[PDB]
Amino acid sequence: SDTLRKIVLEECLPNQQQNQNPSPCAEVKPNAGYVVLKDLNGPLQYLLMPTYRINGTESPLLTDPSTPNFFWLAWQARDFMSKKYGQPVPDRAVSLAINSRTGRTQNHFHIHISCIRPDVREQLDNNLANISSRWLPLPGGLRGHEYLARRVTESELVQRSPFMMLAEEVPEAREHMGSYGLAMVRQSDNSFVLLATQRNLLTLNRASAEEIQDHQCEIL
């Protein structure tokens, strides 16, 4: 359960600090609080994780305003996908996702930056007009699961993180952050859509937001 935490804190960070060599990570920014690591799964997938201990969506630190906006940092890190792709990856192809504890195996905060599934891309595009600033179930859900969705502008994202908005806006999400998985996708009008899904026995929802991603990048 601790391999990623050990890589970050015992390999990347010390190597960055000692030789300015982020290996095995792609980038290590101690002053900003994050690292970027190539994932072993998928040709373009990267992970964005903190340079200090935060275990996942359940961590209380995520609901503190001083905590770095990891989702926005992951968004910026989408360029690592383009570098591996060898050319610019269109924004519409990228998706960011974090899984809850029942939908993950590693206990160190990590956002999956990878390609969005084509069906999810279309499903989101078709509901542009239904996605507002208030969290509301996405019509049709995604992958057979209920997903609350919210429209957000880049300006809003720099002000607050998706976790802050989930906690401040959705009933009882504040006292059950760990039961949620969240994702971020950019919409056709250049705004973004935030997605939140909660663990649910009946629909077999493990709150694994990564399910909207296709690490084999067929959308490209």
mmCIF file of C-alpha atoms in Angstrom:
data_model
loop_
_atom_site.group_PDB
_atom_site.id
_atom_site.type_symbol
_atom_site.label_atom_id
_atom_site.label_comp_id
_atom_site.label_asym_id
_atom_site.label_seq_id
_atom_site.Cartn_x
_atom_site.Cartn_y
_atom_site.Cartn_z
ATOM 1 C CA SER A 1 0.000 0.000 0.000
ATOM 2 C CA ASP A 2 2.981 2.355 0.413
ATOM 3 C CA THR A 3 5.019 1.976 -2.807
ATOM 4 C CA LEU A 4 3.986 5.359 -4.286
ATOM 5 C CA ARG A 5 4.530 7.209 -1.003
ATOM 6 C CA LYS A 6 7.968 5.626 -0.743
ATOM 7 C CA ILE A 7 8.880 6.463 -4.325
ATOM 8 C CA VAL A 8 7.919 10.101 -3.868
ATOM 9 C CA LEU A 9 9.408 10.618 -0.393
ATOM 10 C CA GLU A 10 12.375 8.263 -0.605
ATOM 11 C CA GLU A 11 13.444 8.424 -4.241
ATOM 12 C CA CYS A 12 12.132 11.460 -6.129
ATOM 13 C CA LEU A 13 12.249 14.210 -3.504
ATOM 14 C CA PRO A 14 15.686 13.276 -2.085
ATOM 15 C CA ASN A 15 17.093 12.897 -5.609
ATOM 16 C CA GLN A 16 15.655 16.285 -6.620
ATOM 17 C CA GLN A 17 17.029 17.915 -3.489
ATOM 18 C CA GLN A 18 20.399 16.147 -3.711
ATOM 19 C CA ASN A 19 21.182 16.207 -7.446
ATOM 20 C CA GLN A 20 18.302 18.214 -8.969
ATOM 21 C CA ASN A 21 17.403 14.934 -10.637
ATOM 22 C CA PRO A 22 13.688 14.081 -10.234
ATOM 23 C CA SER A 23 14.086 10.449 -11.346
ATOM 24 C CA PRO A 24 12.128 8.330 -11.237
ATOM 25 C CA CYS A 25 9.688 11.258 -11.310
ATOM 26 C CA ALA A 26 9.329 13.550 -14.311
ATOM 27 C CA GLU A 27 9.190 16.714 -12.222
ATOM 28 C CA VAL A 28 9.631 17.441 -8.516
ATOM 29 C CA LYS A 29 8.604 20.829 -7.091
ATOM 30 C CA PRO A 30 9.116 20.907 -3.297
ATOM 31 C CA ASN A 31 8.244 24.608 -3.031
ATOM 32 C CA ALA A 32 4.876 24.047 -4.763
ATOM 33 C CA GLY A 33 4.183 20.746 -3.024
ATOM 34 C CA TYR A 34 3.923 18.243 -5.883
ATOM 35 C CA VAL A 35 5.642 15.740 -8.165
ATOM 36 C CA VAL A 36 4.698 14.187 -11.498
ATOM 37 C CA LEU A 37 5.371 10.500 -12.142
ATOM 38 C CA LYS A 38 4.908 8.398 -15.257
ATOM 39 C CA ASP A 39 2.393 5.639 -14.551
ATOM 40 C CA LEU A 40 3.283 2.051 -15.413
ATOM 41 C CA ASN A 41 -0.160 1.638 -16.981
ATOM 42 C CA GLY A 42 -0.824 3.263 -20.331
ATOM 43 C CA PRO A 43 1.448 5.018 -22.845
ATOM 44 C CA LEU A 44 0.622 8.582 -21.774
ATOM 45 C CA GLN A 45 -0.587 8.303 -18.179
ATOM 46 C CA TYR A 46 1.011 10.379 -15.453
ATOM 47 C CA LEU A 47 0.249 10.781 -11.782
ATOM 48 C CA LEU A 48 0.354 13.995 -9.788
ATOM 49 C CA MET A 49 1.026 13.554 -6.076
ATOM 50 C CA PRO A 50 1.968 15.797 -3.147
ATOM 51 C CA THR A 51 5.519 16.040 -1.844
ATOM 52 C CA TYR A 52 4.219 15.400 1.671
ATOM 53 C CA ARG A 53 1.752 13.031 3.353
ATOM 54 C CA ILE A 54 -1.865 13.177 2.157
ATOM 55 C CA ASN A 55 -3.487 9.754 1.827
ATOM 56 C CA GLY A 56 -6.355 10.435 -0.522
ATOM 57 C CA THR A 57 -9.828 11.919 -0.866
ATOM 58 C CA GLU A 58 -10.510 11.237 2.827
ATOM 59 C CA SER A 59 -7.667 13.474 4.046
ATOM 60 C CA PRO A 60 -8.894 16.491 6.030
ATOM 61 C CA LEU A 61 -6.117 18.610 4.506
ATOM 62 C CA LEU A 62 -8.058 18.698 1.232
ATOM 63 C CA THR A 63 -10.721 20.864 2.853
ATOM 64 C CA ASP A 64 -8.243 23.490 4.017
ATOM 65 C CA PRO A 65 -7.903 26.605 1.812
ATOM 66 C CA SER A 66 -4.101 26.709 2.165
ATOM 67 C CA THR A 67 -3.695 23.274 0.561
ATOM 68 C CA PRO A 68 -2.381 23.393 -3.015
ATOM 69 C CA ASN A 69 -5.031 22.969 -5.695
ATOM 70 C CA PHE A 70 -3.770 19.602 -6.880
ATOM 71 C CA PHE A 71 -6.439 19.290 -9.575
ATOM 72 C CA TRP A 72 -5.331 22.518 -11.226
ATOM 73 C CA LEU A 73 -1.707 21.409 -10.895
ATOM 74 C CA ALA A 74 -2.563 18.090 -12.557
ATOM 75 C CA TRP A 75 -4.287 20.023 -15.336
ATOM 76 C CA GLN A 76 -1.102 21.992 -15.949
ATOM 77 C CA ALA A 77 0.831 18.727 -15.897
ATOM 78 C CA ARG A 78 -1.194 17.498 -18.893
ATOM 79 C CA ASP A 79 1.790 18.665 -20.952
ATOM 80 C CA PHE A 80 3.664 15.557 -19.888
ATOM 81 C CA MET A 81 1.117 13.607 -21.942
ATOM 82 C CA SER A 82 1.956 15.727 -24.989
ATOM 83 C CA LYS A 83 5.674 15.149 -24.472
ATOM 84 C CA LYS A 84 5.154 11.382 -24.499
ATOM 85 C CA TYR A 85 2.696 11.672 -27.394
ATOM 86 C CA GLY A 86 5.318 13.610 -29.334
ATOM 87 C CA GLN A 87 2.928 16.409 -30.297
ATOM 88 C CA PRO A 88 0.308 18.615 -28.623
ATOM 89 C CA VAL A 89 -2.526 16.623 -27.050
ATOM 90 C CA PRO A 90 -5.866 18.409 -27.495
ATOM 91 C CA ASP A 91 -7.419 19.596 -24.209
ATOM 92 C CA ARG A 92 -10.634 17.714 -25.001
ATOM 93 C CA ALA A 93 -8.705 14.430 -24.823
ATOM 94 C CA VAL A 94 -7.458 14.889 -21.256
ATOM 95 C CA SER A 95 -9.189 13.898 -18.028
ATOM 96 C CA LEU A 96 -8.078 14.055 -14.393
ATOM 97 C CA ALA A 97 -9.386 11.598 -11.830
ATOM 98 C CA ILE A 98 -8.880 10.498 -8.252
ATOM 99 C CA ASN A 99 -10.278 7.307 -6.705
ATOM 100 C CA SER A 100 -11.531 6.769 -3.168
ATOM 101 C CA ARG A 101 -9.979 4.180 -0.860
ATOM 102 C CA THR A 102 -12.190 1.300 -2.050
ATOM 103 C CA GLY A 103 -11.304 2.248 -5.597
ATOM 104 C CA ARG A 104 -7.539 2.434 -5.049
ATOM 105 C CA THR A 105 -4.645 0.335 -3.741
ATOM 106 C CA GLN A 106 -2.116 3.106 -2.927
ATOM 107 C CA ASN A 107 -2.452 5.278 0.158
ATOM 108 C CA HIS A 108 -0.706 8.392 -1.065
ATOM 109 C CA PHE A 109 -2.814 11.019 -2.836
ATOM 110 C CA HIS A 110 -2.646 10.643 -6.581
ATOM 111 C CA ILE A 111 -4.481 12.085 -9.532
ATOM 112 C CA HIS A 112 -4.525 10.133 -12.776
ATOM 113 C CA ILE A 113 -3.836 12.371 -15.761
ATOM 114 C CA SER A 114 -4.793 10.449 -18.857
ATOM 115 C CA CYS A 115 -7.115 10.145 -21.833
ATOM 116 C CA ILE A 116 -10.870 10.352 -21.489
ATOM 117 C CA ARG A 117 -12.988 7.502 -22.880
ATOM 118 C CA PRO A 118 -14.673 8.401 -26.188
ATOM 119 C CA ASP A 119 -18.136 7.492 -24.939
ATOM 120 C CA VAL A 120 -17.685 9.618 -21.832
ATOM 121 C CA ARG A 121 -16.406 12.501 -23.993
ATOM 122 C CA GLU A 122 -19.579 12.394 -26.109
ATOM 123 C CA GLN A 123 -21.877 11.868 -23.139
ATOM 124 C CA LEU A 124 -20.445 14.989 -21.499
ATOM 125 C CA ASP A 125 -20.559 17.066 -24.711
ATOM 126 C CA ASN A 126 -24.226 16.188 -25.215
ATOM 127 C CA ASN A 127 -25.147 17.475 -21.784
ATOM 128 C CA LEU A 128 -23.358 20.823 -21.917
ATOM 129 C CA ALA A 129 -26.651 22.691 -21.477
ATOM 130 C CA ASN A 130 -27.672 20.553 -18.506
ATOM 131 C CA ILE A 131 -24.464 21.112 -16.518
ATOM 132 C CA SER A 132 -24.786 24.196 -14.273
ATOM 133 C CA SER A 133 -22.944 25.755 -11.309
ATOM 134 C CA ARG A 134 -25.036 23.659 -8.914
ATOM 135 C CA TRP A 135 -24.006 20.036 -8.381
ATOM 136 C CA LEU A 136 -26.678 17.872 -9.984
ATOM 137 C CA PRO A 137 -26.694 14.246 -11.155
ATOM 138 C CA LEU A 138 -25.382 14.018 -14.700
ATOM 139 C CA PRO A 139 -28.295 12.773 -16.822
ATOM 140 C CA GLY A 140 -27.544 9.135 -17.628
ATOM 141 C CA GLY A 141 -24.639 8.859 -15.218
ATOM 142 C CA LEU A 142 -21.296 7.478 -16.410
ATOM 143 C CA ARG A 143 -20.287 3.800 -16.608
ATOM 144 C CA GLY A 144 -23.604 2.856 -14.998
ATOM 145 C CA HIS A 145 -22.896 5.036 -11.977
ATOM 146 C CA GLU A 146 -24.417 8.223 -10.628
ATOM 147 C CA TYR A 147 -22.112 11.199 -11.030
ATOM 148 C CA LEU A 148 -22.874 14.645 -9.613
ATOM 149 C CA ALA A 149 -21.653 17.289 -12.097
ATOM 150 C CA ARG A 150 -20.819 20.995 -11.838
ATOM 151 C CA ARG A 151 -19.777 23.589 -14.416
ATOM 152 C CA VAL A 152 -16.733 25.667 -13.403
ATOM 153 C CA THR A 153 -14.647 28.380 -15.053
ATOM 154 C CA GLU A 154 -10.845 28.470 -14.957
ATOM 155 C CA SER A 155 -11.166 31.612 -12.845
ATOM 156 C CA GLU A 156 -13.156 29.732 -10.204
ATOM 157 C CA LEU A 157 -10.653 26.848 -10.183
ATOM 158 C CA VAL A 158 -7.763 29.153 -9.304
ATOM 159 C CA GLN A 159 -9.825 30.366 -6.358
ATOM 160 C CA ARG A 160 -10.864 26.989 -4.999
ATOM 161 C CA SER A 161 -10.189 23.310 -5.502
ATOM 162 C CA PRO A 162 -12.850 20.794 -6.549
ATOM 163 C CA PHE A 163 -12.641 19.324 -3.033
ATOM 164 C CA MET A 164 -13.460 22.683 -1.460
ATOM 165 C CA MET A 165 -16.477 23.068 -3.751
ATOM 166 C CA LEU A 166 -17.672 19.544 -3.033
ATOM 167 C CA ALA A 167 -17.395 20.050 0.729
ATOM 168 C CA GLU A 168 -18.923 23.542 0.740
ATOM 169 C CA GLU A 169 -21.730 22.774 -1.698
ATOM 170 C CA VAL A 170 -22.999 19.194 -1.536
ATOM 171 C CA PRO A 171 -25.064 17.990 1.456
ATOM 172 C CA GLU A 172 -23.157 15.638 3.778
ATOM 173 C CA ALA A 173 -20.169 15.388 1.442
ATOM 174 C CA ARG A 174 -18.145 17.302 3.987
ATOM 175 C CA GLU A 175 -18.492 14.497 6.529
ATOM 176 C CA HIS A 176 -17.886 11.733 3.954
ATOM 177 C CA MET A 177 -15.154 13.037 1.626
ATOM 178 C CA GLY A 178 -13.465 9.639 1.631
ATOM 179 C CA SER A 179 -16.540 8.015 0.095
ATOM 180 C CA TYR A 180 -16.118 10.112 -3.051
ATOM 181 C CA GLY A 181 -14.131 9.840 -6.246
ATOM 182 C CA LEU A 182 -13.757 13.033 -8.336
ATOM 183 C CA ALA A 183 -12.765 13.906 -11.898
ATOM 184 C CA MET A 184 -12.241 16.962 -14.090
ATOM 185 C CA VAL A 185 -12.870 17.361 -17.831
ATOM 186 C CA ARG A 186 -12.853 20.495 -19.977
ATOM 187 C CA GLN A 187 -16.048 21.328 -21.835
ATOM 188 C CA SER A 188 -16.565 22.640 -25.378
ATOM 189 C CA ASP A 189 -17.079 26.264 -24.282
ATOM 190 C CA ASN A 190 -13.729 26.135 -22.491
ATOM 191 C CA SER A 191 -15.289 25.878 -19.040
ATOM 192 C CA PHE A 192 -14.679 22.691 -17.051
ATOM 193 C CA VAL A 193 -16.976 20.083 -15.618
ATOM 194 C CA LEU A 194 -16.324 18.623 -12.189
ATOM 195 C CA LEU A 195 -17.636 15.126 -11.565
ATOM 196 C CA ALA A 196 -18.220 13.447 -8.208
ATOM 197 C CA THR A 197 -19.357 9.871 -7.603
ATOM 198 C CA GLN A 198 -20.069 8.149 -4.310
ATOM 199 C CA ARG A 199 -19.500 4.617 -3.095
ATOM 200 C CA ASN A 200 -22.665 2.572 -3.501
ATOM 201 C CA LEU A 201 -23.167 -1.125 -2.847
ATOM 202 C CA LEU A 202 -26.141 -1.526 -5.177
ATOM 203 C CA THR A 203 -24.560 -0.162 -8.341
ATOM 204 C CA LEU A 204 -21.224 -1.687 -7.380
ATOM 205 C CA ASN A 205 -19.752 1.807 -7.215
ATOM 206 C CA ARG A 206 -16.329 1.721 -5.553
ATOM 207 C CA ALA A 207 -16.027 5.453 -6.214
ATOM 208 C CA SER A 208 -13.278 4.933 -8.784
ATOM 209 C CA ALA A 209 -13.354 8.082 -10.941
ATOM 210 C CA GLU A 210 -10.572 6.652 -13.081
ATOM 211 C CA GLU A 211 -13.337 4.626 -14.748
ATOM 212 C CA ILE A 212 -14.057 7.498 -17.143
ATOM 213 C CA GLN A 213 -10.517 7.203 -18.494
ATOM 214 C CA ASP A 214 -9.077 5.084 -21.325
ATOM 215 C CA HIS A 215 -5.361 4.629 -20.753
ATOM 216 C CA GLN A 216 -5.005 3.211 -24.250
ATOM 217 C CA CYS A 217 -6.023 6.608 -25.635
ATOM 218 C CA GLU A 218 -8.341 5.569 -28.451
ATOM 219 C CA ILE A 219 -9.727 9.119 -28.537
ATOM 220 C CA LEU A 220 -6.495 10.226 -30.175
#
